[PDB]
Each structure stands twice: as structure tokens, then as C-alpha cells.
Symmetry: C3
Subunit: 205 residues, 3 copies
């Protein structure tokens, strides 16, 4: 089966199975393993791998999409001594996650978000982009091949294609999304399309 429980390990005494909204579409060639919550109208495309086997949840909010070849995984959040590793946990609205993906977020083909990480609502994570040990605000755009490592990206900023942002000083000076910016409407178009695709694929299963 492509939707599976995680295994018993020293930090995981009890396997967890994914909680998937009935309106989500999970492609038969995607893999979803472990403590994962997937929200309404989410599309998970072929060859995506969402794997939550190192403790604590990976959450994917409503009307988000996880495109072909995308990987979601996270660093260990509970050591063998049962103790939570606080550095590897993100907090969003009073709850703890290994990876938090907000609502209306697009994770475009071959991108990767690796916990600890949070991605705010209405954000586009571009093709082949990378997010690790970072919090990405709402209404952001990571252009294709950009990366954010170890930083907080403020709401409404974009990272130009190919740029790798590793310092908070850099992240603080990223340009703003404006109406004339080439990717300012990309995420809303992509979300609308993928919500329709998920419904159409559901009608084939």
C-alpha cells in the first residue's frame, strides 16, 4: 500500500497512520507514511514522498498541492530518551509540528521542505526549490531553484530564481511581491487549477 503507518522505533512506541481528508486526492504513485495530516482538496501528485517517521506531525493545510517528486521529511524531534528536541520543532498557533504547510500553498515539482520548517498560507514554493530549518511567511514566492536555510522569510517577500538565502540579514532585505511582479498571481492560479485537478482525479478512482 502507498499509504502506510510508520514503524516502531526507540522514539516511536506506537505506529501512526496518516489522517487524510476524504476530499484529498493521493496519487497511487505517491507515498505517504506515518504521522501526517492532509487537509481538504489537497492534490498529491505522482512520485511525491511525504514521510513522517522521526517524530511529530507533518501537516498539509487545506487546498494545498504537493507536486511530482516533492519530498517532505523531518529531523528527529524526540530522542531515544523520550526527550523532545526543541530545536527541531516548529510552533504554529500553539501547536507543535515537525513540518507545517499552511492553506493554499503550492509545493511545485521537485521542491523539498525538510523539517523543522513552516510555510505560511498562500505561498508558492517554486520548482526544485528547497526550504530547511526555516519559517516562510504568508504570501511569499520562492522562485524556481531558490532556497531558504536557517532563516525567517517575512510575509510578502520573494526569493529570486537560484538564490540561496542562509543568513537572516539577507532574508530581511528580500524584495516585496507587488502587483507588477511576474509571480504575484502565480500561486492563486496554481491553487485554483489544482483544486479542480484533485476533484477530477477523484472521479477516476
Amino acid at each position: 500500500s502507498n499509504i502506510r503507518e510508520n514503524p516502531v522505533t526507540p522514539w516511536n512506541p506506537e505506529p501512526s497512520a496518516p489522517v487524510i481528508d476524504p476530499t484529498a486526492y493521493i496519487d497511487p504513485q505517491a507515498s505517504v507514511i506515518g504521522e501526517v495530516t492532509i487537509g481538504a482538496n489537497v492534490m498529491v501528485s505522482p512520485m511525491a514522498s511525504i514521510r513522517s517517521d522521526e517524530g511529530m506531525p507533518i501537516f498539509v493545510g487545506d487546498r494545498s498541492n504537493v507536486q511530482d517528486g516533492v519530498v517532505l521529511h523531518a529531523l528527529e524531534t524526540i530522542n531515544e530518551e523520550g526527550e523532545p528536541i526543541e530545536d527541531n520543532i516548529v510552533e504554529v498557533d500553539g501547536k507543535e509540528y515537525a513540518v507545517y504547510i499552511g492553506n493554499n500553498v503550492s509545493l511545485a515539482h521537485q521542491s523539498q521542505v525538510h523539517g523543522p520548517a513552516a510555510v505560511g498560507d498562500d505561498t508558492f514554493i517554486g520548482m526544485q526549490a528547497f526550504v530547511f530549518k526555516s519559517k516562510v511567511g504568508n504570501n511569499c514566492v520562492l522562485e524556481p531553484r531558490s532556497a531558504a536555510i536557517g532563516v525567517t522569510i517575512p510575509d510578502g517577500r520573494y526569493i529570486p530564481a537560484g538564490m540561496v538565502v542562509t543568513s537572516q540579514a539577507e532574508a530581511d532585505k528580500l524584495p516585496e511581491v507587488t502587483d507588477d511582479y511576474a509571480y504575484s498571481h502565480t500561486n492563486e492560479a496554481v491553487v485554483a487549477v489544482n483544486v479542480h485537478l484533485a476533484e477530477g482525479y477523484k472521479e477516476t478512482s
Copy 2:
């Protein structure tokens, strides 16, 4: 099944199934969905995803190869009002495509071509490279980790490893493939090998 029709959606009243030449080899762990044409002696490797579900065809010419983990997909080419989005369509020899891959083209492991895009004959798209909203000429080489976004790459040029080309002024000044260039014969060697691999894999099915 790993070869599948695309779904019914507002822009796609009738599902299309892939048209695949009998001499092509499609790995059982690849995915090919929707309005896709695959030519003679093409090799499609494990974990590749070719997905044509947003309108108009993805074409892969004869003796081309689509290696492990490669993604082909395209932006919407027909809006919900049935109207063609001309910005998202490429024209090659009087025909319209969402993605056009020419003959004898190598899409090497983990690369991605995202429509609208065209790739001319005898071109090598290197490992992890990225092509989006671009036309790449014939006899070109994209070295590993290069990218072409929003540009036209003239015939016979190469992009050095890791370079991300986003402006036409940059693309116009790319170096030429010459006989002493390290990748000048790479594509022809790779094409010959993959044509033989496709035949050998066909004999195992």
C-alpha cells in the same frame, strides 16, 4: 496502471490517453498521464513523471530519453472559458504544444522541463537542470544544475554547470559548443546507449 488518461476538468471535457510508439520502453515505475505523444525508441526510466493534464500535448520525439526522476508538466493552456492562453503555448513547425521535446534529446536524471517550453534536436539537458518558459535550440548542452527561464537559447550554445540564465542578454552571450568542449560529444554517446537500453529492456517485458 502507470499509463493513464487525464481527468475530466473544466478545460478538458474529454480524457486523452498517451500515444506511445510500440518501440518505446516505459518503465513500470514511471508515470505517463494524459495527452502525451512518445516517439520511437524512447527510453522512459524509473520514477520519471510525464503529466499532461492542463491542456494541449506534451511531445517527446524519436530516440529521446527521459531519465530517472525527470518531470515534464505544463502550465494551463486553455482557461475555464475554453479560450487558449497563447502565452503558455509553444509553436513548432506549424503545430502547437505545451511542451515539445525534439528528436535525439537526453533529459538526464532529475532534470525538469516545464511548459511552455521547447527543446530542439540533439540537445543534452544535464542532471538536475531546469527549463521553463524557454526555447532551447538544437545541438545545445545544459550542463548539470544549469537552468534556462524565460529565454531563447540559440543553437549550438552551452550553459555552464550551475548557471541560471533568466535574461535574453545573458542567453545571447553563452559560449559555443566546439569539438574540444568537454560535453561536445556527450549527447550522441548518451542517445546511442539509451536506444540500446530501451531495446534490451523491451526484451524483458
Copy 3:
């Protein structure tokens, strides 16, 4: 089947099947094809592709891990005339390989090692990183999105995130891993975790 022989071709008269230690865990959604040796306690994750069909072995040492979406493949090592192509072969401890991955090595999500290549013991190859025509020493760290092409990386060095190293002069001046370096203990933590994951996943099969 996801574990398969390679095909008969002009350079490969006899198919080879993978040799896999009984304590290794190969995910059902990974692909392993051809002349491949996988050592003890190795974890091979969903969507990884290890493909040895162009001659000579791909070796993955004990307690190594091959994470989601990783690709291992190699250039042709035997031409159609039966003659070994020495440029495309690496030698490690008196034996020849197309790709050699040492013991306790982590190939993190979406990375790729393409032969000819060798990766020494206790080395971390970071997320989305790329190694091709290179020898990477022991105790090295390739940070996410780094790449080494055509070079030898000395023992105990790291490549900063996003850096693409293509010249030996560059590789010779890479910084050293020290105890205060952010990734100095990452590989040992990741190896220990993955050895435990492999055992837990084995208990589900």
C-alpha cells in the same frame, strides 16, 4: 518487481541481479536494477532509483542510507567492443567500480551521485546535492544544494550550501570540518537514526 536484473545489451551479455544483505531494507517504492551490491543495515527510501545497467558495479557500503528520490547511475564503463573505458571507472582498495559509496554514508533526499564517482566513509551528501566524476574523501560534508564535478574533495572538508565546485584549485581550498561547524555531527546522528529506521521497517515486511 522493484528489485530487477539489468537487460542484455552489447556491453552486457549476461544479466546481473542485485546482491542485497538480508539486514538491508529496500522500500517497495524504490527501484534497484542490475549489478548493485548493498551492504548491511542500509536503508533505501521511497522513490530512490539505483540503476546499474551500463557496466560494472554500484556498491553501497554498510550502514549507509539512500534517501527519498536519490538517484545512483553511471556512465558506460565497457564499450560495445568489450573494451573497458578507464576514464569511467573508479578504483577503491584494488577493486573497480562505476560508483562506490562507502560505509556510514548518508545520501540525503533528492541528491544524486553519478559515476564515475567515489564517496568515502562517514560523509554526508546533503539534500539536492550532486556528485559526478569526483572522489569525495572521508568525513566530508556536502551541504544542501552543493555540487562536486570533476574534482577530488580532500578528507574532512565541507562544501557550503549552493556552491558548485568544478576545479581542483577550488576543491583544494575548501574549509575544514571542525567541532563548532554546524554540520560536524550531522552525519553520525543521521546514520544512527537510519540504522534504527531500517530495522523498524524490516519488522513491517
